[PDB]
Amino acid sequence: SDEADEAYSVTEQLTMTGINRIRQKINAHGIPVYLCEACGNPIPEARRKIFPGVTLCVECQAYQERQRKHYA
């Protein structure tokens, strides 16, 4: 084939694997938790409605994402 078509297939692979990585991160399935899995605080049922199966609060979730920003 051509030097463009190979690049098309590689770009499709790259965007596919990215999109699947970020669909895998979202939960949308699990059992209701009723309270944080880190601090014990309650998860308000609105946030649980937005994501079925939120193992964390918003506070602990933000904290964990924020430590993970430095990738450790």
Partner 1 sequence: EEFDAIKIALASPDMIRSWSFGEVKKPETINYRTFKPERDGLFCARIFGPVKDYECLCGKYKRLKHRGVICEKCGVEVTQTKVRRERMGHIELASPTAHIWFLKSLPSRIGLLLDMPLRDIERVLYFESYVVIEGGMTNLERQQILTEEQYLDALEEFGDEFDAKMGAEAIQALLKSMDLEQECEQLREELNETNSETKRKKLTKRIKLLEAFVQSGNKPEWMILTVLPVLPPDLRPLVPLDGGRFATSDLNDLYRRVINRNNRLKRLLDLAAPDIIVRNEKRMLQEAVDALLDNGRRGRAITGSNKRPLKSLADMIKGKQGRFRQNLLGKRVDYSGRSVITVGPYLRLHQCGLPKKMALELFKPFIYGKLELRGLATTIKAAKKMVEREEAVVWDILDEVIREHPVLLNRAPTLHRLGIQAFEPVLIEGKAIQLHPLVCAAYNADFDGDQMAVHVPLTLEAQLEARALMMSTNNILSPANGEPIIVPSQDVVLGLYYMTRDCVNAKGEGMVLTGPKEAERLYRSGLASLHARVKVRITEYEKDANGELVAKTSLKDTTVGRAILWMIVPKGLPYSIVNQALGKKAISKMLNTCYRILGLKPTVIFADQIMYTGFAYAARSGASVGIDDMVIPEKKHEIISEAEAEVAEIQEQFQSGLVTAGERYNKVIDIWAAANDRVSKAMMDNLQTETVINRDGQEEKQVSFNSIYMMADSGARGSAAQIRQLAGMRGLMAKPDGSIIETPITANFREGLNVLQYFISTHGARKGLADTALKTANSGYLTRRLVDVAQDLVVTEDDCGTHEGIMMTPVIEGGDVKEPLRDRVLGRVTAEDVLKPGTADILVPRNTLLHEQWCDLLEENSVDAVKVRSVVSCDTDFGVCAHCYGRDLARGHIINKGEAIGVIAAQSIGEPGTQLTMRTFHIGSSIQVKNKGSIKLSNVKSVVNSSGKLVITSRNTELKLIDEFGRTKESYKVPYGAVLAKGDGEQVAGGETVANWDPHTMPVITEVSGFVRFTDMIDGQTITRQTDELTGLSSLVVLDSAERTAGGKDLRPALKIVDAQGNDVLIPGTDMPAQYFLPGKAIVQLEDGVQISSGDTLARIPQKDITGGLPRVADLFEARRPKEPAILAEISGIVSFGKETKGKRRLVITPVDGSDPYEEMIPKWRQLNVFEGERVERGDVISDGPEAPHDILRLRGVHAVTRYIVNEVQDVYRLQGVKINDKHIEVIVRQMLRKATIVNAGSSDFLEGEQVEYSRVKIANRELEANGKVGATYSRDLLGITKASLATESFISAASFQETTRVLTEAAVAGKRDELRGLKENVIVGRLIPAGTGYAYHQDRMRRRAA
Which residue ranges make up the site for ligand 1N7 (CB under 6 A)? 9, 12-13, 16-17, 20
Residues in 19-48 that interact with partner 1 by CB under 8 A: 19-26, 44, 46-47
Residue 72 is a binding residue for partner 1 (CB under 8 A)? no
Nearer to ligand 1N7, 16 or 35 (CB): 16
Half-sphere exposure (Cβ direction) of 2: Cα atoms closer than 13 Å: 3
Q: Distance (Å, rounded) from C-alpha 28 to C-alpha 51? A: 6
Report which residue's Cβ sits closest to ligand 1N7. Answer: 13
Contact 26, 53 (CB under 8 A): no
